[model samples]
Target: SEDELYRQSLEIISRYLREQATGAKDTKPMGRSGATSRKALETLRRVGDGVQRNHETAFQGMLRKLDIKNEDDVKSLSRVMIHVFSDGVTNWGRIVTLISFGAFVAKHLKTINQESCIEPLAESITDVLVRTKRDWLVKQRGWDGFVEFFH
Candidate 1:
């Protein structure tokens, strides 16, 4: 009963997006359900606690590395994520890194009251991952196989 990393992180991230859409809430967790979704969700859960625990400095370092600015809106953030994927080798491990980094970015956005960005941010991450890695994702059975692989 001591473990809430996955659920809590999912709540903070997905709930923000869900609420943004309905202007109230959407508690169902299948908005964009699939391998890309599963991969991002599972990876976020795996690294979510570490991201939160070290976010202060981690966020600072990321802002510096990505050159994020007060003026960088969701669109720029989307491009930045594309750049992140462009430079990395595609693999499940790399996807985990990207998703975990997204968790960091989502938390930072919340701190700034830009919670509306969470929805587009989630879409952007999924879009980029699936667009670039669709074939490989299918080959790996996406999250379905991920469960069997790590179950």
Candidate 2:
């Protein structure tokens, strides 16, 4: 119980540190939130899915650099994914890379239930991506104007 608790604490601290770090960068979800409902989701998913289809092989290859096949491996990749994604928004299409790679990684993590902190990490990953995108959009187009556009 002590060891498990410590491990959990470690994960919690790590997550907080990541949140703080990325938060410092100020991100948002403009692209997905900019247009009409269903239209926005459809548009983003199309990019993600397209990446999944064409880049799955190359994506997996990049992940191979992490050499993950166990618990720590999963956490390492999770961290890498979050940070990689954090910087990814800096360039165009990199977000799509993270979106597809994230889905691919999540599927891989899901199959091995109860093995690691995959679920929580995955949630955090989703949270950051969505959060940053939302903030980014707000700053870019202004939320009021954005909603009106979709309206």
Candidate 3:
């Protein structure tokens, strides 16, 4: 059920970032945009598979170098994400790197029993994307374009 869990998590995340659902209401389904977001998450996981196989040492090295252990860790991490995106050139490759790196952090968060950190950290990454790459993403028709671009 990881796909279901991932979809739900992504639903919560996209809602948190892109739309603020009232707390009293049942969760709003992401629908088509949500399906595209799920595609985005899967792509990140696929990228993570490669990172784990080929770049794990380097990934873990960067992780330990950052030394993320809690929400404060995300504060530092979010800053780095902003800096990286500041270059102003948006591409799927760069996005893959951004998201794969986040997967690494998520795993570490899981290990440290700070699983709660995942949602906020996810917000940081997606927020950076929407903020920095909104124009490009719009041109590409959002995440649906991502699915088309890859396959």
Candidate 4:
């Protein structure tokens, strides 16, 4: 079974490489003129189709591992996607802090998936915000916007 899986993996990789090669060749400008060039382009199109099919198969396998059962699950996850932005209205330091925290949380998505993950993250962020000096906060505009600021 292991050997069969390995073979299948290799097959997929091989096909992907072949598809890329053909696609690249088709797109590249060759000096050749005539039916030969047209035939190469057609072959490249066929390779593109194969690449799409194989990519879908590989993606489905990965999704299964992640326990994503349906499109609705993906939709729900998309809805909760985080957005971070500072409108140049804030001090550079505060903007940097916001960007840094957002990047940190994004990179630790798997670890943050643990129970009540948001609580700890929110606490950390609040701690940082509180520790920042009043002068700094004032210079940073001090969170004047509503909850929908990021939206």
State each candidate's clash count: 0, 11, 0, 0
lDDT of 2 by residue, 1-151 (tens): 3333223323332333333223332134322323343343344345556777787788788767866566677656656765777756443356446545655655555455532554555455555554556556445443233234434
Candidate 4 residues 29-71, lDDT tens each?
3232323334433432344344445465553454354443333
Point out the higher-scoring one by lDDT: 3 or 4.
3
What are the per-model C-alpha RMSD values against the true structure?
8.2, 12.0, 8.1, 22.4
lDDT of 3 by residue, 1-151 (tens): 3344344444534443222112232244455456776665555445545655678898888898888978988878877888866474788777766766776677677668887777788778776766677678678776677667765
- In what order do the candidates fall by lDDT, top score first? 3, 1, 2, 4
My TM-score estimates for the predictions, one after another, are: 0.64, 0.52, 0.73, 0.27
- Any idea what lDDT model 3 has? 0.64
- lDDT: worst 10-residue window of model 2: 17-26
Best by lDDT: 3
Write down the worst ten-residue block by lDDT for model 3: 17-26
lDDT for each of the candidates?
0.58, 0.49, 0.64, 0.34
User: Which predicted model would earn the best TM-score?
Assistant: 3
Q: Please identify model 2 stretches exceeding 4 Å from their true place.
A: 1-38, 88-92, 111-118, 130-135, 141-151
